Amino acid sequence: GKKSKATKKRLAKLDNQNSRVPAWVMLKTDRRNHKRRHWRRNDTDE
Amino acid sequence: ARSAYSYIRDAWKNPGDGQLAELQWQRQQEWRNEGAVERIERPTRLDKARSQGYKAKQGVIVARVSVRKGSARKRRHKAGRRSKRQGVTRITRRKDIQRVAEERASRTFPNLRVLNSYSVGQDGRQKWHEVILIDPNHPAIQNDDDLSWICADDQADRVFRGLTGAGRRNRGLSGKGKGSEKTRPSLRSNGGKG
Amino acid sequence: PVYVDFDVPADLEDDALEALEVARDTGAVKKGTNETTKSIERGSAELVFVAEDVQPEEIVMHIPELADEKGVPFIFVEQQDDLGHAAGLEVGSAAAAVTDAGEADADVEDIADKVEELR
Amino acid sequence: GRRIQGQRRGRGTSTFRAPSHRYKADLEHRKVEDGDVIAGTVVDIEHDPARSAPVAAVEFEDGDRRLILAPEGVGVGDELQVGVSAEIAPGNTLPLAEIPEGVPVCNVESSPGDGGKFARASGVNAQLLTHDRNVAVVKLPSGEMKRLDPQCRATIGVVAGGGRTDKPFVKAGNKHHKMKARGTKWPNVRGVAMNAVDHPFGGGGRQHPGKPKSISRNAPPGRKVGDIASKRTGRGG
RNA sequence: GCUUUACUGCAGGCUGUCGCUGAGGACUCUCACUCCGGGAGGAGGACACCGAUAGCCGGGCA
RNA sequence: ACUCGUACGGUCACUGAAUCCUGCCCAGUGCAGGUAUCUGAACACCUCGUACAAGAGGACGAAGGACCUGUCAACGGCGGG
RNA sequence: CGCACGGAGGCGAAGAACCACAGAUUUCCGAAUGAGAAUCUCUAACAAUUGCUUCGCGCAAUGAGGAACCCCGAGAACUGAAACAUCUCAGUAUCGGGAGGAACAGAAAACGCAACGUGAUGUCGUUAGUAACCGCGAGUGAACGCGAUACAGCCCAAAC
Ligand SMILES: [Cl-]
Ligand SMILES: [Cl-]
Ligand SMILES: [Cl-]
Ligand SMILES: [K+]
Ligand SMILES: [Mg+2]
Ligand SMILES: [Mg+2]
Ligand SMILES: [Mg+2]
Ligand SMILES: [Mg+2]
Ligand SMILES: [Mg+2]
Ligand SMILES: [Mg+2]
Ligand SMILES: [Mg+2]
Ligand SMILES: [Mg+2]
Ligand SMILES: [Mg+2]
Ligand SMILES: [Mg+2]
Ligand SMILES: [Mg+2]
Ligand SMILES: [Mg+2]
Ligand SMILES: [Mg+2]
Ligand SMILES: [Mg+2]
Ligand SMILES: [Mg+2]
Ligand SMILES: [Mg+2]
Ligand SMILES: [Mg+2]
Ligand SMILES: [Mg+2]
Ligand code: NA
Ligand code: NA
Ligand code: NA
Ligand code: NA
Ligand code: NA
Ligand code: NA
Ligand code: NA
Ligand code: NA
Ligand code: NA
Ligand code: NA
Ligand code: NA
Ligand SMILES: [Sr+2]
Ligand SMILES: [Sr+2]
Ligand SMILES: [Sr+2]
Ligand SMILES: [Sr+2]
Ligand SMILES: [Sr+2]
Ligand SMILES: [Sr+2]
Ligand SMILES: [Sr+2]
Ligand SMILES: [Sr+2]
Ligand SMILES: [Sr+2]
Ligand SMILES: [Sr+2]
């Protein structure tokens, strides 16, 4: 499949959203990413 | 003494008699080749126009509109309906042809507001009406004492809300007493029984 | 055209519009169809002018029969703008009236006679 | 029930439409002012997909390249003339007034200058009979006497591709190919072989029509099937 | 869901009538209107179309 | 839409290559044509009625029906004595 | 020094944080308006429809949104009638168009406790399940008046 520049920016954002909650937030909040998406298990838009 | 206007009026009492009979037979031939909504520089019935609110001023536009004669252009039921609701041929619309004309005109002129309208005859298959429209944004109207009321925000889209004279008459608002129980203050406030 | 039953020659019209220009500077003239109608009704009309290019024709339609039932003579002018300038206005006029002429009474009298001879 | 096949037809969908894009030309007569001074040489003889008959490619004196409904005998290099003072030869188009009686014509017009309506199919011809100042009676291929205007243009000769009907299709595959170039749905399923919901003749335990096949002219679309307003049926009697 | 000479109705078709619509129970005409023609113009013509209504048919449909 | 189409066309149906063939029936039903006469709505028109109106009746009478004819490769029929 | 309590660091007595008002900035798509496009792209833009017009997009207007409310149009069926067709559900559901902060209505060709009477309009209470409708079945269903709320009356067309 041939993706456009806008589609590429969106996929790029979704890849970044797929990172975990950093070590320091856990300590700052005294203690989970609910938007964890897998390439196989979950489906993205478009 | 009689006004010159009273002669245009007396002529239109019988549009199938005299010199007007000959005039209509001629005009309608050009009108049939004209569009749905046609802007005319001067009103065909000067007396009626002036009586309805027209003035030879800047921002006072007039236009002729042709609408089809007859009942509703209805489709037959595609689903189940009881006998009463199975009609097509005898069903008529609740808005008169004049009101259909005023709306078609107002849509053609999205900036202008409908003042009033009048009939200018009919042939075998269509009816013609001339609608007087006003520019609520021209200072020639914003300063005119006899017309500046139409510039107010609550007069916007007056024809689509039935605030025209032809609108109010069609809504059953003529009589102030008996018969107007289900019509005044509005049809929608009375449950739609008028 | 529905009210026009006789064609007025280009020269007879010139004689008429010249008589109107000197009628305003001496006696009195009425400008506009309403004022023309009230002249024929009050009898104060000597010679009434009517334009041929009036759209709509209803505004003027009545003048030929109204003049014929009041004895008042009438004449046709081709253009609306020429009659208006003749009455002394920047804007055109559909109809004008000569209410008591002046130093044109001899000309107006002959024009009224020339039109009757033209039927 | 459901709408019958003849009702789906009128909707004008892909399945029912003619392959217009694959068609060559709208075979109409040329327009002459008067005088007749319009002529041309035949460049080629092509096949018209719309009628299964040949069509002549003619080039005119005024640079105009157009395809024309070719009668029999027309070839490459032949000179055809169109107009009032045209020669009484095959392939030339002139009004019925100028054409002599008893001469087979094709591509006849209904109203003058329309382009040609009658006698246009493979090998058919109209026969010009009577002459007048008012009426020119033409006998159309159906055997009908059409009273026409003498100013109606017609091409001389019989239409080309005669006797096409003679050879049988033999196999369904041949009918398939022909049908693919027309505006028709093929194959035909008999109504009597359908369900009650689908056709007036559908239903039953055995295949037979429900009511008599002959239907009234006044019948509504959805009921008007079988033998439409038949004056009679059968061969005998 | 389907059927029909079940009950009741609704489209659709045919037909009379009214309007458009005009000049001189059969008939002429040209000007509305219609169609053909690029056009000049040709054909048709107060009919047809369309709007309204009336009778007949009308499991096509509810 | 059919249709860049025009009866050697294309629409609507039945039968279902070839070969030998395809009888009799039009009373009913359907379709179609005709029709003296009969039947046949509304508008206009005429009588009555009403100072008008409702309404009652009459004359004229379209398609349709009656009646007559054609038609079964049209629905279908082809027995008892 | 947001939620958010870490680590490093920083800002604040030049009065920060914080709150109120006002202003600056305010990518792309979006009514989306130069044209095209799944938020990007291609070579000056009120696109489209209008009004006025120096007839030049020069000056303006419309478009779209909004919790419901409001006004103008289109308009069911289940259901009830112990079936069902009128009736009923109901001018409801739903659909098309549109306004405002409220809408609509509104200064009698009214009423008609008939009078020597009332006096623009909405709305609330009542009149009243009354009059009226209806296979006169099931069901349907006002008004004048009265008591209140609030009150406010005017402009053209024509004559001259
Ligand atoms: Cl408006
Ligand atoms: Cl074939
Ligand atoms: Cl009272
Ligand atoms: K029901
Ligand atoms: Mg990663
Ligand atoms: Mg209200
Ligand atoms: Mg052709
Ligand atoms: Mg065959
Ligand atoms: Mg095909
Ligand atoms: Mg088959
Ligand atoms: Mg089967
Ligand atoms: Mg069926
Ligand atoms: Mg069988
Ligand atoms: Mg069979
Ligand atoms: Mg055409
Ligand atoms: Mg049924
Ligand atoms: Mg078989
Ligand atoms: Mg853009
Ligand atoms: Mg029930
Ligand atoms: Mg009961
Ligand atoms: Mg009710
Ligand atoms: Mg009352
Ligand atoms: Na996936
Ligand atoms: Na508007
Ligand atoms: Na009502
Ligand atoms: Na029979
Ligand atoms: Na048998
Ligand atoms: Na902002
Ligand atoms: Na704008
Ligand atoms: Na401009
Ligand atoms: Na029940
Ligand atoms: Na039931
Ligand atoms: Na009822
Ligand atoms: Sr998967
Ligand atoms: Sr608006
Ligand atoms: Sr002027
Ligand atoms: Sr053509
Ligand atoms: Sr053609
Ligand atoms: Sr069957
Ligand atoms: Sr036989
Ligand atoms: Sr029979
Ligand atoms: Sr905290
Ligand atoms: Sr008061």
Side-chain angles (χ1 to χ4, degrees), chain C residues 48-106:
Chain C
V48 288
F49 287 69
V50 150
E52 292 182 359
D53 67 345
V54 191
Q55 211 293 300
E57 298 189 49
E58 283 105 345
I59 302 170
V60 165
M61 255 162 63
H62 65 288
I63 312 286
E65 192 170 46
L66 191 62
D68 286 346
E69 69 193 291
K70 281 273 187 164
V72 180
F74 64 107
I75 189 169
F76 291 119
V77 179
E78 309 301 276
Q79 290 186 77
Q80 208 172 288
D81 294 336
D82 299 337
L83 184 53
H85 192 70
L89 289 173
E90 298 180 85
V91 184
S93 182
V98 190
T99 180
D100 287 85
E103 284 159 21
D105 287 273

Side-chain angles (χ1 to χ4, degrees), chain B residues 1 3 5 39 50-51 58 61 74 81-85 93-95 99 107-111 135 137-138 146 156-157 160-161 163 168 170-171 176-178 182 184-189 191-192:
Chain B
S3 62
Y5 303 137
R39 177 176 172 163
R50 287 183 60 76
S51 180
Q58 296 172 112
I61 291 92
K74 233 217 161 186
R81 250 86 189 157
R82 54 170 192 118
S83 71
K84 238 276 174 169
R85 309 302 189 186
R93 313 262 89 142
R94 296 173 193 220
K95 273 198 279 180
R99 238 146 89 64
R107 267 176 180 108
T108 308
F109 297 107
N111 57 316
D135 190 326
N137 298 284
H138 200 302
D146 303 339
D157 291 338
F160 308 106
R161 297 191 288 139
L163 304 180
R168 289 173 176 134
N170 180 70
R171 285 200 291 164
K176 298 191 74 172
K178 188 229 292 170
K182 313 287 188 304
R184 189 165 291 114
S186 76
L187 294 167
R188 197 187 168 256
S189 71

